[PDB]
From a paper:
MM1309 consists of three structural domains (domains 1–3), a common feature in the members of the EF-Tu/SelB/aIF2γ superfamily. Therefore, we propose that MM1309 functions as either a guardian protein that protects the Cys moiety from oxidation or an alternative translation factor for Cys-tRNACys.
We determined the crystal structures of M. mazei MM1309 in the GMPPNP-bound, GDP-bound, and apo forms at 1.7, 1.9, and 1.55-Å resolutions, respectively (“Materials and methods”). The electron density is well defined for the phosphate moiety and the guanine base, but is weaker for the ribose than the other moieties of GMPPNP. The amino group and the N ε atom of Arg14 hydrogen bond with the β- and γ-phosphate moieties, respectively. The guanine ring is mainly recognized by the conserved Asp103, located in the 310 helix between β6 and α4. The side-chain carboxyl group of Asp103 hydrogen bonds with the N1- and N2-atoms of the guanine moiety. The Mg2+ ion is mainly coordinated by the β- and γ-phosphate moieties (3.0 Å) and a water molecule (2.3 Å). In addition, the side chain atoms of Thr15 (2.9 Å), Arg14 (3.4 Å), and Asp46 (3.3 Å) participate in the Mg2+ coordination. Surprisingly, MM1309 bound GMPPNP·Mg2+ much less strongly than GTP·Mg2+, with a dissociation constant (K d) of 222.2 μM.
Author numbering: -10 to 350
Write the structure that this text describes.
């Protein structure tokens, strides 16, 4: 039994459209759905074509990593846009990020096809087979496409992209359905006031099934709240299973006190210090005690200091690129997480900024 006249009936896909500068990212996203929520990322919604699809354009990347990381941590499918001759620093950084995230499902969009030639496209694909070997992208399809209605071959490859997205989305729906039995957690990406309709948050159900009228908590505040209503593409729904992008009216909390990265759930760890078992990128600098890094977990980010490095339980003076270690880290602000949340570490002053992934000990 469910609300309304027709069940919402799963079908959804949360897609991140990412990549380097001048890769056609915004153009692709903007042609895949209607412009919605817009901050340092922009949602393009398309619930007109079967699935409740949302495409997130990380449009403030490469300037900021948080734009990229937010897009990726609220999405289940990544579309990496690489333009002709587009094997540059930020393309490599995107590849590294996706591989550190263990990002399962994705597609490479070889954009601007009208500006290139089949033989050049085949050479770029050959090259990519190599760069992606031994990474999570190794079996991603590469689809040549453009979003130019005036090209000789207008919008070639777009239909094939959409078809592949739908194919991948189907696999994700089944994986997300397995999570329905877990306790509910919802990651918040936006919070604002709506007139005569107070505190509203936008986010995604990460696991379980969130239900209208649930009495639960918000972290890191550690405050009791009630879910007053849940909306899915603007229609009130009684429940929202894992993978569902939601709007929620909340009781007992003001939008002014909620930030992106807050979590709705019955229980979260809240700390300002972290002990992470980490694997260090091969493409970063050795990490040393007292060094400063940037930590991402869920949709939160903040500066941290490396207090201690350990290997096999013994303290060391460095963690080299491509090594495994335990890092004891300190920060200022309280962050909320559970042990299943993957952490990323970055050095914002480097060219390739991702340093490591880790999990809380
Ligand atoms: N011929 C052609 N040009 C395209 C296509 N898609 C985008 N462009 C052009 O290439 C430029 C970059 O496109 P854009 O969508 O802004 O990519 P972006 O990666 O979002 N750019 P930015 O890094 O500034 O945010 C724009 O001038 C745009 O008109 C395409 O399919 N064909
Ligand atoms: Mg962009």
């Amino acid at each position: 039994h469910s609300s309304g006249l027709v069940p919402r009936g799963s079908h959804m896909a949360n897609v991140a459209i990412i990549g380097t500068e001048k890769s056609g990212r915004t153009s692709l996203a903007a042609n895949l759905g209607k412009k919605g929520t817009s901050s340092d990322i922009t949602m393009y919604n398309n619930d007109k074509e079967g699935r409740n699809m949302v495409f997130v354009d990380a449009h403030s990347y490469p300037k900021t990593l948080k734009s990229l990381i937010t897009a990726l941590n609220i999405s289940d499918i990544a579309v990496l846009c690489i333009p002709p001759q587009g094997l540059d620093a930020h393309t490599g950084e995107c590849i590294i990020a996706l591989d550190l995230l263990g990002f399962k499902h994705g597609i490479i969009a070889l954009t601007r096809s009208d500006s290139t030639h089949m033989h050049a496209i085949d050479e770029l694909k050959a090259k990519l087979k190599v760069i992606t070997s031994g990474t999570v992208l190794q079996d991603w399809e590469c689809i040549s496409l453009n979003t130019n209605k005036s090209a000789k071959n207008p919008f070639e490859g777009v239909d094939e992209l959409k078809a592949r997205i739908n194919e991948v989305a189907e696999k994700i729906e089944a994986e997300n359905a397995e999570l329905n039995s877990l306790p509910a957690r919802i990651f918040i990406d936006h919070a604002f006031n709506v007139t005569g309709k107070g505190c509203v948050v936008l986010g995604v159900v990460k696991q379980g099934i969130s239900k209208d009228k649930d009495k639960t908590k918000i972290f890191p505040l550690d405050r009791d709240i009630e879910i007053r209503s849940i909306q899915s593409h603007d229609v009130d729904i009684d429940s929202a299973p894992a993978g569902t992008r939601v709007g929620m009216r909340l009781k007992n909390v003001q939008a002014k006190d909620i930030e992106r990265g807050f979590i709705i759930s019955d229980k979260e760890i809240v700390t300002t210090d972290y002990t992470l078992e980490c694997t260090v990128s091969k493409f970063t600098k050795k990490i040393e005690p007292a060094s400063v890094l940037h930590l991402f977990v869920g949709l939160q980010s903040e500066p941290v200091r490396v207090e201690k490095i350990l290997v096999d339980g013994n303290e060391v003076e460095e963690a080299k690129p491509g090594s495994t270690c335990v890092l004891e880290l300190s920060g200022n602000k309280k962050l909320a997480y559970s042990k299943q949340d993957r952490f990323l570490l970055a050095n914002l002053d480097l060219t390739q900024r991702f340093a490591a992934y880790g999990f809380s000990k």
